[PDB]
Amino acid sequence: ETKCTLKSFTVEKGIYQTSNFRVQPTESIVRFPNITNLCPFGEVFNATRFASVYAWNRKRISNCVADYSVLYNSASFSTFKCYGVSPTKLNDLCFTNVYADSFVIRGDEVRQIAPGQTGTIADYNYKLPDDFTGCVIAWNSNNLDSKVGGNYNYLYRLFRKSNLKPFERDISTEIYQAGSTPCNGVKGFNCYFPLQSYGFQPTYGVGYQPYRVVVLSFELLHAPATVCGPKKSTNLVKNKCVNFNFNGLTGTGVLTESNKKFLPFQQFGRDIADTTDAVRDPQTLEILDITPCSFGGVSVITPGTNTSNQVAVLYQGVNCTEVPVYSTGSNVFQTRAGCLIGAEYVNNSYECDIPIGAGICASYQS
Amino acid sequence: QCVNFTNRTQLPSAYTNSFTRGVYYPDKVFRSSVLHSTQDLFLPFFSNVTWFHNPVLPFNDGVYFASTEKSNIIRGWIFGTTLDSKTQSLLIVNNATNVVIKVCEFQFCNYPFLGVYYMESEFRVYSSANNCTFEYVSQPFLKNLSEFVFKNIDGYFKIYSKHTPINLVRDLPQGFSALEPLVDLPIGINITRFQTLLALHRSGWTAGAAAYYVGYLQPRTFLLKYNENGTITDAVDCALDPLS
Numbered sequence: 001e002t003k004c005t006l007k008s009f010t011v012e013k014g015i016y017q018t019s020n021f022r023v024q025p026t027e028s029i030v031r032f033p034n035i036t037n038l039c040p041f042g043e044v045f046n047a048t049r050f051a052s053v054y055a056w057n058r059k060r061i062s063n064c065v066a067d068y069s070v071l072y073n074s075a076s077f078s079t080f081k082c083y084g085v086s087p088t089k090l091n092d093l094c095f096t097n098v099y100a101d102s103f104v105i106r107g108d109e110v111r112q113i114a115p116g117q118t119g120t121i122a123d124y125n126y127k128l129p130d131d132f133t134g135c136v137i138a139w140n141s142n143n144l145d146s147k148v149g150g151n152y153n154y155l156y157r158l159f160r161k162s163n164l165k166p167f168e169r170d171i172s173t174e175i176y177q178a179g180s181t182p183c184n185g186v187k188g189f190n191c192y193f194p195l196q197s198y199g200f201q202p203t204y205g206v207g208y209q210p211y212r213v214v215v216l217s218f219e220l221l222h223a224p225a226t227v228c229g230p231k232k233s234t235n236l237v238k239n240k241c242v243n244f245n246f247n248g249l250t251g252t253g254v255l256t257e258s259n260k261k262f263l264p265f266q267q268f269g270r271d272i273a274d275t276t277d278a279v280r281d282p283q284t285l286e287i288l289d290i291t292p293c294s295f296g297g298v299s300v301i302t303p304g305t306n307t308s309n310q311v312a313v314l315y316q317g318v319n320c321t322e323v324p325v326y327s328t329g330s331n332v333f334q335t336r337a338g339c340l341i342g343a344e345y346v347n348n349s350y351e352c353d354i355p356i357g358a359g360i361c362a363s364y365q366s
Numbered sequence: 367q368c369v370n371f372t373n374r375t376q377l378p379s380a381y382t383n384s385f386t387r388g389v390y391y392p393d394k395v396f397r398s399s400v401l402h403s404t405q406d407l408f409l410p411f412f413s414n415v416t417w418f419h420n421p422v423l424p425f426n427d428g429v430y431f432a433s434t435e436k437s438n439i440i441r442g443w444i445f446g447t448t449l450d451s452k453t454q455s456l457l458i459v460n461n462a463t464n465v466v467i468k469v470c471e472f473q474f475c476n477y478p479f480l481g482v483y484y485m486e487s488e489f490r491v492y493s494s495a496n497n498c499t500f501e502y503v504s505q506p507f508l509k510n511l512s513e514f515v516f517k518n519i520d521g522y523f524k525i526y527s528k529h530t531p532i533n534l535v536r537d538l539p540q541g542f543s544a545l546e547p548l549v550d551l552p553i554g555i556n557i558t559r560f561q562t563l564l565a566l567h568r569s570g571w572t573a574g575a576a577a578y579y580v581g582y583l584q585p586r587t588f589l590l591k592y593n594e595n596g597t598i599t600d601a602v603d604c605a606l607d608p609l610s
């Protein structure tokens with residue numbers, strides 16, 4: 001190394017600096033507050049009864065942490081068509097509001113609930129925009145809605161004069177007029193009822209079977225985002241140079257116990273030039289302490305390649321505790337200048353030959 | 367539900383020196399025995415604050431609200447722009463056991479009072495509340511010099527508070543007391559005006575000791591001192607004197 005840095009095949013007696021040395025981080029850790037205030041997804045996906053499609057039930061979700069993974073991995077969903085984003089990455093990005101629209105439809109009509117789709121349900125009871133971002137879940141509910149005598153409580157607007165804009169609920173009970181024959185809110189020549197009921201029965205074939213549907217739409221208005229997925233935290237280690245992510249404040253170093261005393265509202269401390277020196281962990285609320293893990297230059301002591309061929313090594317300003325082929329080598333000694341390997345200390349005293357520092361120096365005898 | 371009155375109360379809006387009050391911790395960092403210079407919104411030293419003994423006052427940037435209260439006559443505050451059904455509004459109250467914060471866009475009437483009965487059950491501050499979004503409950507905020515700083519930046523409403531045992535008769539004390547962060551709220555409103563909520567005995571309204579002080583914040587540079595324990599003990603305003 002000395003030959004390479006010095007760009008020569010011969011080297012004279014002296015001390016030269018070749019390179020640097022620094023402890024590498026072992027692993028990474030992340031800490032975050034306790035997970036709490038979960039969004040109340042239970043009362044929607046486990047509601048006793050659902051609303052009909054023409055009066056589809058809309059709920060607002062904000063100011064809570066939402067876990068979609070439990071829904072995503074759940075195998076009780078016969079249909080999980082999730083368009084706006086990739087569901088796996090859904091736990092990462094987050095928004096300012098969520099809208100959950102719940103209702104009950106027939107099995108075949110499920111495919112109508114998608115961007116750029118048309119049909120009775122897709123145009124007369126609930127409409128999705130072409131640019132819709134969100135995620136649709138549907139599951140069979142035969143054992144609940146179907147009745148042996150036929151359930152008729154669920155209704156849908158079969159007839160309507162005009163189509164529906166996206167997210168446009170209309171509960172108007174106008175007697176639809178097919179022709180030009182006027183009706184004073186009564187039936188007649190060309191007058192019918194816009195809303196017709198379902199006839200759900202246990203023996204109805206699949207696709208003619210009731211399916212409960214929930215659509216999640218994500219709203220990202222300029223107001224601060226309050227709905228975000230949970231943050232996974234890990235265990236914390238000590239006395240090892242690692243890289244950490246304490247509540248978004250990231251950095252490398254070794255963590256020790258500290259005797260400082262924060263006021264009950266600080267989170268972390270710094271001293272001068274704005275360098276962080278202590279953090280309070282969100283889960284234990286005890287003050288830790290940060291110290292950069294050791295680094296420093298290395299130097300080679302040689303008596304001149306003409307005389308001999310063996311050298312000694314000095315690590316500058318490094319405690320002789322974490323040195324690491326030259327991990328043990330020869331007798332190891334510790335000085336105010338650093339740690340010195342390959343040389344042996346004596347209790348004599350001669351004129352300084354190769355100045356090492358702090359009042360000590362080395363020479364060749366070995 | 368509210369009615370007008372013949373005894374049209376008005377307040378002696380006198381003026382008073384600000385002295386060196388209205389200092390709060392600007393962030394969450396801990397510093398020990400050091401002098402730190404920060405540029406932020408403060409209440410300038412030795413300014414003039416308006417002393418009252420209910421108008422609608424501008425919010426501007428932020429406000430500093432102080433009360434040499436006894437028995438906690440004051441109740442709450444209302445913030446917004448138009449204070450009607452059309453525009454979103456904010457309300458804060460503290461009746462007897464908890465602070466209640468709402469971001470409900472309800473509309474008020476001419477006289478926003480609470481009223482008590484002598485087992486108290488009386489609340490007719492507003493009438494109708496159609497749409498709204500947010501709610502919050504916490505521990506109550508409140509001889510007793512209470513100081514509060516209300517700020518609203520970047521869609522966040524910040525409240526700092528402090529309480530002191532006062533012994534001087536009427537003027538603000540010539541002491542030092544930094545204000546600690548009390549709460550933060552993530553709500554986007556365009557607050558520009560506000561008012562104040564009052565509690566009166568009803569059985570005969572008795573609301574005469576409405577003595578408090580109001581001041582306004584401006585951007586400037588301050589120099590703060592932190593002792594060993596990391597608390598603020600003294601501060602220096604910068605654009606006040608050549609010596610400063």
Ligand SMILES: *[C@@H]1O[C@H](CO)[C@@H](O[C@@H]2O[C@H](CO)[C@@H](O)[C@H](O)[C@H]2NC(C)=O)[C@H](O)[C@H]1NC(C)=O
Binds near residue numbers: 042
């Ligand atoms: C809706 O209810 C079902 C069944 O009640 C939940 O599925 C399981 O529910 C039992 C309790 O009855 C839990 O012990 C299981 O852990 C649930 N399975 C899971 C979570 O995979 C279902 O979780 C409920 N859904 C919501 C959103 O609350």
Ligand SMILES: *[C@@H]1O[C@H](CO)[C@@H](O[C@@H]2O[C@H](CO)[C@@H](O)[C@H](O)[C@H]2NC(C)=O)[C@H](O)[C@H]1NC(C)=O
Binds near residue numbers: 034282283284285
């Ligand atoms: C966060 O969760 C941790 C883990 O349960 C809580 O720490 C526990 O606190 C109770 C006291 O309420 C102790 O009896 C347990 O021994 C603690 N467990 C551990 C692993 O430390 C903690 O209280 C929760 N809250 C906060 C704010 O951290």
Ligand SMILES: *[C@@H]1O[C@H](CO)[C@@H](O[C@@H]2O[C@H](CO)[C@@H](O)[C@H](O)[C@H]2NC(C)=O)[C@H](O)[C@H]1NC(C)=O
Binds near residue numbers: 319320321
């Ligand atoms: C190099 O590191 C070792 C180990 O950390 C230091 O030895 C420690 O010394 C302190 C005070 O002298 C004791 O309280 C510890 O118990 C010691 N630890 C061990 C494991 O023995 C040593 O002092 C360091 N060298 C220098 C020059 O500071």
Ligand SMILES: *[C@@H]1O[C@H](CO)[C@@H](O[C@@H]2O[C@H](CO)[C@@H](O)[C@H](O)[C@H]2NC(C)=O)[C@H](O)[C@H]1NC(C)=O
Binds near residue numbers: 461462463464466
């Ligand atoms: C102050 O006002 C709050 C808000 O109304 C009251 O909180 C209610 O308390 C009752 C009974 O304690 C609960 O059933 C309600 O759910 C609480 N919230 C609401 C919105 O009503 C509080 O009780 C009031 N303080 C006193 C002393 O009456």
Ligand SMILES: *[C@@H]1O[C@H](CO)[C@@H](O[C@@H]2O[C@H](CO)[C@@H](O)[C@H](O)[C@H]2NC(C)=O)[C@H](O)[C@H]1NC(C)=O
Binds near residue numbers: 496497
């Ligand atoms: C609650 O908010 C909704 C949506 O903002 C209001 O419904 C319509 O909102 C648009 C947008 O401002 C207005 O142009 C319409 O006139 C509103 N419809 C009606 C019938 O007023 C709604 O008015 C608000 N209030 C209530 C009580 O729902």
Ligand SMILES: *[C@@H]1O[C@H](CO)[C@@H](O[C@@H]2O[C@H](CO)[C@@H](O)[C@H](O)[C@H]2NC(C)=O)[C@H](O)[C@H]1NC(C)=O
Binds near residue numbers: 593595
């Ligand atoms: C700083 O914090 C300490 C710790 O609570 C306060 O208490 C003092 O602690 C020291 C020991 O470090 C004692 O010698 C004092 O007698 C304690 N004083 C009191 C009033 O208990 C201390 O008061 C705080 N302030 C200062 C300026 O040190």
Ligand SMILES: *[C@@H]1O[C@H](CO)[C@@H](O)[C@H](O)[C@H]1NC(C)=O
Binds near residue numbers: 306307
């Ligand atoms: C090495 O040292 C010997 C002994 O003095 C000398 O004879 C020789 O010339 C030296 N060689 C070099 C390259 O310095």
Ligand SMILES: *[C@@H]1O[C@H](CO)[C@@H](O)[C@H](O)[C@H]1NC(C)=O
Binds near residue numbers: 345
């Ligand atoms: C040198 O002296 C020290 C005491 O100062 C002693 O501990 C050591 O054994 C002696 N010998 C060597 C080789 O260091």
Ligand SMILES: *[C@@H]1O[C@H](CO)[C@@H](O)[C@H](O)[C@H]1NC(C)=O
Binds near residue numbers: 376
């Ligand atoms: C009338 O109002 C003033 C100011 O609020 C008050 O001091 C006075 O006691 C009131 N008088 C009556 C009879 O209410």
Ligand SMILES: *[C@@H]1O[C@H](CO)[C@@H](O)[C@H](O)[C@H]1NC(C)=O
Binds near residue numbers: 381412413414
């Ligand atoms: C505050 O205003 C009053 C009247 O507006 C004035 O008399 C007083 O001197 C002012 N205080 C100052 C300028 O510090």
Ligand SMILES: *[C@@H]1O[C@H](CO)[C@@H](O)[C@H](O)[C@H]1NC(C)=O
Binds near residue numbers: 507509531
């Ligand atoms: C009033 O001041 C006393 C100190 O004299 C304090 O203990 C009390 O908490 C204060 N009250 C309020 C509501 O802050």
Ligand SMILES: *[C@@H]1O[C@H](CO)[C@@H](O)[C@H](O)[C@H]1NC(C)=O
Binds near residue numbers: 555556
């Ligand atoms: C309210 O503030 C927002 C934030 O910039 C702004 O876009 C909007 O125009 C404001 N509305 C008003 C002032 O009525």
